[PDB]
Specification:
The structure is cut from a larger assembly and holds chains A and B. Chain A is an all-alpha fold. Chain A contains 2 helices and no strands. The chains are: A mainly alpha, B mainly alpha. Chain B: It is found in: Mitochondrion inner membrane.
């Protein structure tokens, strides 16, 4: 053929779907705003959590001392006296 | 029994390698067969290899190093923060010891005790990150402090090195005394040297409701000592002279 009859549909192939572009734009806005709200919530967390000491890793002694309160140097004076019988 | 030490291998290995390097250097620096060889670069390369190996040990023990946490509770408490902090400090030490090899032979400074002291101060630092008590905190501070006091005055020909070493010594000793005096009263007013139980007796009541003149001033002295340690203004009495 001639030049323009091919350059026309060439440019038309080069250009994209606008419906896809609009859908992607509204989508991206939706999830970006949702993620923005999520990050805003995340930044509100205090440095020290409400539980803190309640956490099992932050006790480390309520389940260690009971198995140590029997060794010498930690016993209540009234433990060795009546342990004989 | 032995498996309770799976959480201390990244440190036991570095101590053992430090001892082996010290023995090898002292044995083969006075041998008449080899005519007193300059084995500073050799010890440095072996120390870099040891640092790499203990880094590999530390990196692959991520699921480990948290076992027997009740047994080690009174001594140290290592976790994800400690794991990454140690794995980065050890990399920094490896890079520093690697970029100083040419310094040993360019200006003919074949003292292998430099490398062993770097390694042992690095072990002290590894103790510090895991340290979870005032006593271990202070002892791990003192390890690196004494290593650096020794190392700073190593080059004993220049008036700068000796005077800077002495100034670093005096400033660090004063800072350590200040920090230790700070910890003494926090122990006195509450007991509970351990960090876990120190964070639980102080969270109960705010300082604003009632004033405790002991805990506040002990915390202040600990902070002052730490600011001396990092040379933070106005506690920067001699730091530029130390670094020069």
């Amino acid at each position: 053929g001639f030049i323009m009859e091919f350059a026309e549909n060439l440019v038309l192939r080069l250009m994209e779907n606008p419906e896809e572009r609009d859908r992607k734009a509204r989508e991206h806005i939706y999830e970006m705003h949702e993620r923005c709200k999520k990050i805003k919530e995340m930044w509100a967390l205090p440095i020290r959590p409400y539980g803190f000491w309640t956490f099992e890793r932050h006790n480390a002694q309520l389940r260690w001392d009971p198995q140590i309160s029997q060794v010498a140097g930690r016993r209540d004076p009234y433990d060795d006296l009546l342990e004989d019988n | 029994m032995f498996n309770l030490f799976l959480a201390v291998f990244p440190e036991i290995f570095i101590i053992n390698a430090t001892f082996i390097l010290l023995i090898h250097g002292v044995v083969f620096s006075t041998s008449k067969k080899y005519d007193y060889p300059p084995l500073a670069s050799n010890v440095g390369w072996l120390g870099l290899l040891s640092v790499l190996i203990t880094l590999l040990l530390l990196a692959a023990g991520a699921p480990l190093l948290t076992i027997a946490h009740l047994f080690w509770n009174n001594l140290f408490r290592r976790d994800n923060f400690t794991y990454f902090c140690q794995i980065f400090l050890l990399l920094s030490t490896a890079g520093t010891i690697s970029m100083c090899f040419d310094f040993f032979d360019q200006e003919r400074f074949d003292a292998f005790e430099f490398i062993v002291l770097i390694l042992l101060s690095t072990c002290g630092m590894l103790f510090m990150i895991s340290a979870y008590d005032l006593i271990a905190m202070y002892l791990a501070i003192e390890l690196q402090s004494l290593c650096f006091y020794v190392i700073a005055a190593s080059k004993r020909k220049s008036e700068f090195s000796t005077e800077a070493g002495l100034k670093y010594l005096i400033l660090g000793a004063f800072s350590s005394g200040i920090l230790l005096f700070g910890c003494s009263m926090i122990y006195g007013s509450t007991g509970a040297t351990h960090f876990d139980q120190l964070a639980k007796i102080l969270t109960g009541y705010e300082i604003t409701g009632a004033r405790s003149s002991g805990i506040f001033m002990g915390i202040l002295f600990i902070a002052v000592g730490f600011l001396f340690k990092i040379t933070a203004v106005p506690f920067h009495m001699w730091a530029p002279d130390i670094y020069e």
